[PDB]
Amino acid sequence: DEDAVPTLSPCRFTGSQICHREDGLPLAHVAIAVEGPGWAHPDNVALQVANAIIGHYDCTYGGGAHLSSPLASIAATNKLCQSFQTFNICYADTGLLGAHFVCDHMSIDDMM
Amino acid sequence: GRQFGHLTRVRHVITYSLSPFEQRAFPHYFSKGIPNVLRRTRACILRVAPPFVAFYLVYTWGTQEFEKSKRKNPA
């Protein structure tokens, strides 16, 4: 124990963009996030609710137009993607809160 | 017209970006800026300047000569 155990440093969030463009691949993956509060925070519960409301989609989902989620509904009706998923990844004192999706090259905008 | 998604084909190129609320609008504006404009002028003087000095000398001559022409001295 006694010698040179350190605690974790806090991690700076940038917010920033990384675009690795490869038209040889047949579909686009985007993953967007704002900064999360992380493990401890009471706000996780409430964010997870809001996330749940947006939810997730997949082209194998049963019954499309009538989904509760307005994202997932429009996604399915207008064939705007193949998949999405909301998320809230937690770390100590920080985390990534957003969604990731997958779609055709002419969907990336509308999906966004 | 022509639309994004349908422009051209591009493979293997990573663009790294930054939010403008994360960075300076004016970064090293005089530190790096003044060295560049010098370099750009240096770059272009011998193409841009000589016709205008050519004009300059033909203007100041043609002025000098025109009004000196409307003179006599003997007879």
From Swiss-Prot, chain A:
Coiled coil: none annotated. It comes from the Eukaryota. Signal peptide: none annotated. It is found in: Mitochondrion inner membrane. Component of the ubiquinol-cytochrome c oxidoreductase, a multisubunit transmembrane complex that is part of the mitochondrial electron transport chain which drives oxidative phosphorylation. Component of the ubiquinol-cytochrome c oxidoreductase (cytochrome b-c1 complex, complex III, CIII), a multisubunit enzyme composed of 11 subunits. The complex is composed of 3 respiratory subunits cytochrome b, cytochrome c1 and Rieske protein UQCRFS1, 2 core protein subunits UQCRC1/QCR1 and UQCRC2/QCR2, and 6 low-molecular weight protein subunits UQCRH/QCR6, UQCRB/QCR7, UQCRQ/QCR8, UQCR10/QCR9, UQCR11/QCR10 and subunit 9, the cleavage product of Rieske protein UQCRFS1. Belongs to the peptidase M16 family. UQCRC1/QCR1 subfamily. This is Cytochrome b-c1 complex subunit 1, mitochondrial. The gene is UQCRC1.
From Swiss-Prot, chain B:
The chain crosses the membrane at residues 39-67. It comes from the Eukaryota. One of its GO terms (cellular component) is respiratory chain complex III. The modification N6-acetyllysine is found at K32. The keyword Isomerase does not apply. Belongs to the UQCRQ/QCR8 family. This is Cytochrome b-c1 complex subunit 8. It comes from Bos taurus (Bovine).
